[PDB]
Structures are given as C-alpha cells and as structure tokens.
C-alpha cells in the first residue's frame, strides 16, 4: 500500500487565459481546481485552484509510461505495485489579465512551475509574458513549458510554435527550460509531463528549523447551514507553509490581524488563536510542513474566517517577532517594458505620489510613494503588511488605462 502523507512540493500551473491550466490540473489528479460557482457559472478561474495527487513508477517497465499516479502497475502489464515516489500538489492560478495579481500571490506558494502555452494561439501572449516574468522575479525557476491542445494542430505547426519558444527563452534564465506537449483534455502524452515533473521539479530542502510560517490565501468554516452558534465548529485558515513546520495545539497568530474600528479610526490588531486541526486535502495530520495547501483549524469565530476574509495574511506562533508595516522601504527595479500589456509600452520611472499596488507574500496592498531615489522608493501603506523576513521580494504594479499591470520588483528593506 501507499503511504498517506501530505504533499511535499507545490507547483503553479501559470499562463494566458484559457490556455487550458485547469484542464491540465485535471489531466494530472483527476481533479476539476475550480470549485466556486461564479467560477463554474463563467467558465473561468478566479481564486486560486489547488490539486494533490500521488506520484509513483513502475521499475520494471520503461519511461515515461512507467510513471504512474495511482499505485498500479496493470498499464504496463505487471500486477506489482509502483514504487511510491512522492505527493505533489498544484497551485492552480487564473489566466485572465485582471487577475494578475491573484496570480502573484499564488507565485509566493510554488516550488517549481509549469508555464501552460496553448499550440493554437499565437505566441507569446500577454499573460504568457506577464507570469513568465513574475515567475523569474520571484524566483520560480524550476520551470516547464506544457505546449497544451497539440491535439488541434498539425504536428509541424506545434513544431514552429516550439521553435518560437526556445527562441524568446534563449538569453533568459529559461534558455534550457524543457517543452513537453500534451493535450490535456484528450489526456495525451501526459506521462511525459509526469516524468518531466520528476526531473525537472524536485522537492526543495527545508530547513525545518526556521521560524514557522504560513501565507494564508483562504478563510473559512465547516458548519452545515442551520446549525446552532453556541456549537459552530472554529474558523479554518487555508494557505503554505513557507518555512518551519506548524503541530496541532500550537499557539498561534494572525497578522497583520483583524481590523479594528474606533469610530472612524481603524487600526489592525493581531488575531490569537490555537491551531486544533490540520487537514491536507481529505487527510488529517498531527503536523504540516512546507508543500501542499493546508487547511488550519482554530478556536476563531467563524465570522472572522468567514469567505476569505484574510487572504494575505500570515500565520506565525504567537510569540514570534514579525514586523507588521504602515510604511516600507523598497530597494527595487524596473522593467523596460509592461509586458503583460497588448500594445507595447515603456515602463515609466516612478513618480511621488503615485499608487503603486504591492505584491507582498500572499498580500495584495495599496500605496503611495512618498520617496523615490534611483535604487529605493518608500511607501506608505492604505493597510499594514507582515513583514517576516529580511529579504523579501515585492512586485510591484501600476495602473495603466485602467488595469493593474506588472511593472517591476524590489526587496523589503528593513
Ligand atoms: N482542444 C483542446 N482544448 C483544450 C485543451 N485543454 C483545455 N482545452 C479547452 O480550453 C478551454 C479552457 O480550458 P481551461 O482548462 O478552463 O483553461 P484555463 O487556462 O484554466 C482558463 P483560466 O485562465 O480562466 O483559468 C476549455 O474549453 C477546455 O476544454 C486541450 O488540450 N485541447
Ligand atoms: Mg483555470
Ligand atoms: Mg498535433
Ligand atoms: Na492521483
Ligand atoms: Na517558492
């Protein structure tokens, strides 16, 4: 039998709208990622997508159609069981432009990542840039391109996209990343990706001695409708473990918190809480470790978890050191150009005070520069953000004809 464990690696699945993401997720676990129903009304992501699936080989038969993600070996004519290898999970992201910054939050969850490109679409798109870029800001590098819906096209037209790609990757960091096609809908050639997930994606060390930290993205409850307050189950928060490792009836807190409102004033304070469950998927665990998207029980009110309410929140214990900021200076760069935009533009210098949106962790928050210098901006903040660490990396963007749009990075100086 196979071992259940949580997953231990997260990979994002990034690329232009409907380039077939979350058919791949599906593809790969069985499993449809969308599952809010203004999601499935318009066919489209819009939180971010989360699957798990087991990863196994079947030793005496050859690659990649060894590479199996239940524990059977019948595919390939032998009734041994595969050899477990690891579980892995997807970050699944939204393609659509007014999106973007939703992908980025997912970016802060990922290991490694596969860049869908769609064989029957001309290449390269707009968000197709746009996650590429954020994905080699952030760090994301441990990439694959998936050219998807190979199934419509001729194979030397997919050749010619092929061949488009290695040209915009080379002189990147990306110069050598692979292209595995597949059709995810008719389920073609997905072994190979399978493969190429375990050769090009392997799970990071962690180091489990560092302070223990959770970007949240999801907040929510378990209680059936009609059920009596005074015996509502405790509020669940969803997200990654970014480091350490979190246990159940650790004493923990929320920052930058919850929202307080002193007629008119409001200020945030931190919430506390005690973790009473941790759940991966359908699975229960005494722990949860980087990888995978844990849902963290807690004693909270569900009015406090209640539909997402601290998305781009932290979780820490409760007595760990973490900044929570008003104001942050940003030691930062510019792109050239706005990549995620249809025509082509040139990334203006920042201006004093201009809003800029700041991708933080998780968070998403609005500012206003109060400084600028050739390396460094300062910005004061309409909401605080935690700050855990001293070499956190922001992205940063900028409203252009009225879209948020990618325009460059910087590191949180503290
Ligand atoms: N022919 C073909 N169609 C595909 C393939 N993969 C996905 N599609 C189709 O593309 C459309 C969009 O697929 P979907 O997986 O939702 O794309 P997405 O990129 O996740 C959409 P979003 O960016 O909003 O998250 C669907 O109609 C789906 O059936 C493929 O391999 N071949
Ligand atoms: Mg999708
Ligand atoms: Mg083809
Ligand atoms: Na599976
Ligand atoms: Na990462």
């Known amino acids: 039998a196979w071992p259940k464990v949580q997953p231990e690696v997260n990979i994002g699945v990034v690329g232009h709208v409907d380039h077939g993401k979350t058919t791949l997720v599906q593809a790969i676990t069985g499993i449809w990622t969308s599952k809010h129903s203004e999601e499935?009304?318009?066919?489209?992501?819009?939180?971010?997508?989360?699957?798990?699936?087991?990863?196994?080989?079947?030793?005496?038969?050859?690659?990649?159609?060894?590479?199996?993600?239940?524990?059977?070996?019948?595919?390939?004519?032998?009734?041994?069981?595969?050899?477990?290898?690891?579980?892995?999970?997807?970050?699944?992201?939204?393609?659509?432009?007014?999106?973007?910054?939703?992908?980025?939050?997912?970016?802060?969850?990922?290991?490694?990542?596969?860049?869908?490109?769609?064989?029957?679409?001309?290449?390269?798109?707009?968000?197709?840039?746009?996650?590429?870029?954020?994905?080699?800001?952030?760090?994301?590098?441990?990439?694959?391109?998936?050219?998807?819906?190979?199934?419509?096209?001729?194979?030397?037209?997919?050749?010619?996209?092929?061949?488009?790609?290695?040209?915009?990757?080379?002189?990147?960091?990306?110069?050598?990343?692979?292209?595995?096609?597949?059709?995810?809908?008719?389920?073609?050639?997905?072994?190979?990706?399978?493969?190429?997930?375990?050769?090009?994606?392997?799970?990071?060390?962690?180091?489990?001695?560092?302070?223990?930290?959770?970007?949240?993205?999801?907040?929510?409850?378990?209680?059936?409708?009609?059920?009596?307050?005074?015996?509502?189950?405790?509020?669940?928060?969803?997200?990654?473990?970014?480091?350490?490792?979190?246990?159940?009836?650790?004493?923990?807190?929320?920052?930058?918190?919850?929202r307080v409102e002193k007629q008119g004033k409001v200020s945030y304070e931190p919430i506390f809480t005690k973790i009473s469950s941790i759940r991966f998927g359908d699975e229960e665990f005494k722990e949860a470790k980087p990888g995978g998207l844990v849902a963290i029980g807690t004693y909270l009110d569900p009015s406090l978890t209640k539909a997402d309410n601290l998305l781009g929140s932290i979780i820490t214990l409760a007595d760990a050191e973490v900044p929570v900021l008003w104001n942050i200076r940003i030691k930062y760069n510019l792109l050239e150009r706005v990549v995620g935009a249809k025509e082509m533009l040139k990334v203006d210098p920042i201006r004093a005070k201009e809003t800029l949106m700041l991708s933080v962790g998780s968070s998403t928050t609005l500012g206003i520069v109060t400084s600028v210098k050739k390396d460094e901006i300062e910005v004061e903040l309409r909401r605080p953000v935690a700050v855990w660490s001293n070499n956190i990396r922001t992205v940063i963007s900028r409203q252009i004809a009225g879209r948020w749009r990618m325009i460059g990075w910087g590191l949180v100086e503290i």
């Open 40 to 258: 499935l009304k318009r066919g489209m992501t819009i939180k971010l997508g989360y699957a798990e699936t087991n990863i196994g080989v079947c030793e005496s038969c050859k690659k990649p159609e060894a590479y199996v993600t239940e524990p059977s070996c019948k595919s390939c004519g032998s009734d041994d069981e595969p050899k477990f290898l690891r579980r892995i999970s997807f970050i699944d992201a939204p393609g659509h432009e007014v999106l973007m910054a939703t992908m980025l939050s997912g970016a802060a969850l990922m290991d490694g990542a596969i860049l869908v490109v769609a064989a029957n679409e001309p290449f390269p798109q707009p968000q197709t840039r746009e996650h590429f870029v954020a994905l080699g800001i952030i760090g994301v590098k441990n990439l694959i391109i998936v050219q998807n819906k190979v199934d419509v096209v001729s194979k030397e037209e997919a050749l010619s996209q092929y061949r488009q790609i290695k040209q915009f990757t080379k002189g990147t960091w990306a110069e050598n990343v692979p292209i595995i096609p597949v059709s995810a809908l008719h389920k073609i050639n997905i072994d190979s990706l399978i493969e190429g997930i375990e050769e090009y994606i392997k799970t990071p060390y962690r180091d489990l001695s560092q302070k223990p930290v959770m970007l949240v993205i999801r907040s929510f409850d378990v209680n059936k409708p009609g059920t009596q307050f005074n015996e509502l189950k405790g509020g669940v928060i969803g997200g990654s473990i970014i480091q350490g490792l979190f246990k159940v009836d650790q004493e923990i807190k929320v920052l930058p918190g919850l």
